[PDB]
Amino acid sequence: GVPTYLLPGSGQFLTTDDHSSAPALPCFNPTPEMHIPGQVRNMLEVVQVESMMEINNTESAVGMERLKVDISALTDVDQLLFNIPLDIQLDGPLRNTLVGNISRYYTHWSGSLEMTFMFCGSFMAAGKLILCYTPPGGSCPTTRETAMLGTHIVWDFGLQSSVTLIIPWISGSHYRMFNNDAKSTNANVGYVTCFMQTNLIVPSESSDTCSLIGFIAAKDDFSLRLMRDSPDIGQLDHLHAAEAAYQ
């Protein structure tokens, strides 16, 4: 017949191989395809949707207080309000986001991010903020004179209640890794900080402690590769009733 020989790699079950396999139910007629709304054909559709950052990932912020940042009227000039760890691949405010949870199924990621901050004060509350994306290399900037040298956006509080801090893809490498080393040149992204441009100024009938909801999506520049399993989920024992699926 046909003179063949087995290569190395014969009879091995690679999990990610793509080969046609034997149909269990022959001449099966699957259910006809109905137009179900909202088909995802590519996971970067899911990533480019905005999703809330937990910038307030502190203690004494229990549950939903972690999603908003309380900013107040300040008596000092040009004070730091918050800074955001930009490690998508590591634990931090970007982790439980749509750009974060999907990228923790991957290792190498590229493309520009997109931070959107929705002010949730009163309509009478007037204020201005600066949102400085500092490219990495140095420490997180604590004064505004240090931070506004980087990429920033200055935001007035009026009719439109949100800016977009585009985090540009500034990297030497084409992609960026996970390493468990947040301080690596291949993994570190930079630092987004926020400072009072002027101040949060409310009248006597508005609440003095207004809020900021911080979103992050990715852009059309964004890309992911080198798929891995997510570290966001674990499994110590069998789940409950999993033994009852066999009974």
């Binding site: 079950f13 269990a24 439980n96 999907i102 800016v163 585009i166 979103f215 798929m227």
Partner: protein
């Protein structure tokens, strides 16, 4: 606008923009739309021909990785004296994506999935020399008659798709088709299966593939063996609808989406993301 996107998009160069009326950084989250501020529109960019392929983020490539769905070590011996609870050389398994959390969290990213299961059954054996056992893995539909013995006459497989395979062979790989009565597998089923109020919440039997009754075709040998049968499911020909928040809290059960969370952050109930000192404290700071 539906368009074919094979690589990530290029970045056009931009110049100094000082224009009244056009404020592209200012956008409205309250509309629900994600902000359309291009990086050209926010900062000053160069021309970048981006050749980064988006092909590994395809939902076909996302979910077509053969992940574990079942695992039973079961004794292979004389079962004349064993109790009537353990596997007497066979196990039934209602085919269930919910048993193992890596594939479960990936399939629970979406609401509706339309996939073909590429079931790979890896059988491995340990002694309590190794035998070359032959195994039958009879595919029983949901709720149909499952066998009661190893040598019962349900295993004759008049119409159920049995697959006969050996331990020394490569692992048995069959293709379960798209077997839902609906046009997609309801991964989450906000509703009840029965018309009475006793039905189990969330468990749509249309989402259930069926039973995978697996026995060892050989008779009982004088020494006992512990046979571990791992089942690997590869979803393929995948259409996916309505993506969801990925589950952050640990799973409690396979029947429902109950949550307890970790005791402390990360992935706790009161605190999903791990804590830090203040909102103005940077945890991984480059201090030189």
């Amino acid at each position: 606008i539906e368009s074919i996107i094979k690589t990530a998009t290029d970045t056009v160069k931009s110049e100094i923009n000082a224009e009244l009326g056009v404020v592209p950084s200012l956008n409205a989250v309250e509309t629900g739309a994600t902000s359309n501020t291009e990086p050209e529109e926010a900062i000053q960019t160069r021309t970048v021909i981006n050749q980064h392929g988006v092909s590994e983020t395809l939902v076909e490539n996302f979910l077509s990785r053969a992940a574990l769905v079942s695992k039973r070590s079961f004794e292979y011996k004389d079962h004349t004296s064993s109790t009537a609870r353990a596997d007497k050389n066979f196990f039934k398994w209602t085919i269930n994506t919910r048993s193992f959390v890596q594939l479960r969290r990936k399939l629970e990213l979406f609401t509706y999935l339309r996939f073909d299961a590429e079931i790979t059954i890896l059988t491995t054996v340990a002694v309590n020399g190794l035998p070359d056992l032959t195994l039958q893995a009879m595919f029983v539909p949901t709720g149909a008659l499952t066998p009661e013995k190893q040598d019962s006459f349900h295993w004759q497989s008049g119409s159920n798709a049995s697959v006969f395979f050996k331990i020394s062979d490569p692992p048995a790989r069959i293709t379960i088709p798209f077997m839902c009565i609906n046009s997609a597998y309801s991964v989450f089923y906000d509703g009840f299966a029965g018309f009475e109020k006793n039905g189990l919440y969330g468990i749509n039997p249309a989402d259930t593939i069926g039973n995978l009754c697996v026995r060892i075709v050989n008779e009982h040998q004088p020494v006992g063996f512990t046979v571990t049968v791992r089942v690997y499911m590869k979803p393929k020909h995948i259409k996916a609808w309505a993506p969801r928040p990925p589950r952050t809290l640990p799973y409690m059960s396979i029947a429902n989406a109950n949550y307890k969370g970790k005791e402390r952050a990360p992935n706790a109930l009161s605190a999903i993301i791990g804590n830090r000192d203040s909102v103005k404290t940077m945890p991984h700071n480059i201090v030189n």
